[PDB]
C-alpha cells in the first residue's frame, strides 16, 4: 500500500463490469491525454479491435477482436488473501 503507482502494469489480471482481463499495454494514446489502458478480455465477444488502426499496430492480442481501451478507474485490482477473508 503506497501513493506511487507500479511501473509493471502490464501484465496485470484486472476485473471490469464483472469480467477478468489481461493487460496488454500501459502507456498515453495520441487522441486522448488520459491515462487508457488496453485490456484483451476472456471472452472475444465483449472485444473492440484488435488494437491496431492504419496498419500502427499499438498493442498485441490473441484474438483479432478482443482488445479494448479503458481507464484505472473502470479497472479493479482487487484485495489480495488475508483481505479478502476479512471481508467475506
Given at each position: 500500500m503506497?501513493d506511487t503507482?507500479?511501473a509493471?502494469?502490464?501484465?496485470?489480471?484486472?476485473?471490469?463490469?464483472?469480467?477478468?482481463?489481461?493487460?496488454?499495454?500501459?502507456?498515453?494514446?495520441?487522441?486522448?491525454?488520459?491515462?487508457?489502458?488496453?485490456?484483451?478480455?476472456?471472452?472475444?465477444?465483449?472485444g473492440?479491435?484488435?488494437?491496431?488502426?492504419?496498419g500502427?499496430?499499438?498493442?498485441?492480442?490473441?484474438?483479432?477482436?478482443?482488445?479494448?481501451?479503458?481507464?484505472?478507474?473502470?479497472?479493479?485490482?482487487?484485495?489480495?488473501?488475508?483481505?479478502?477473508i476479512?471481508?467475506?
Amino acid at each position: 500500500m503506497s501513493d506511487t503507482l507500479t511501473a509493471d502494469v502490464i501484465g496485470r489480471r484486472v476485473e471490469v463490469n464483472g469480467e477478468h482481463a489481461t493487460v496488454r499495454f500501459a502507456g498515453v494514446v495520441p487522441p486522448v491525454a488520459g491515462p487508457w489502458l488496453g485490456v484483451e478480455w476472456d471472452n472475444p465477444e465483449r472485444g473492440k479491435h484488435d488494437g491496431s488502426h492504419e496498419g500502427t499496430v499499438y498493442f498485441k492480442c490473441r484474438h483479432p477482436t478482443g482488445g479494448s481501451f479503458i481507464r484505472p478507474n473502470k479497472v479493479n485490482f482487487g484485495t489480495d488473501f488475508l483481505t479478502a477473508i476479512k471481508n467475506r
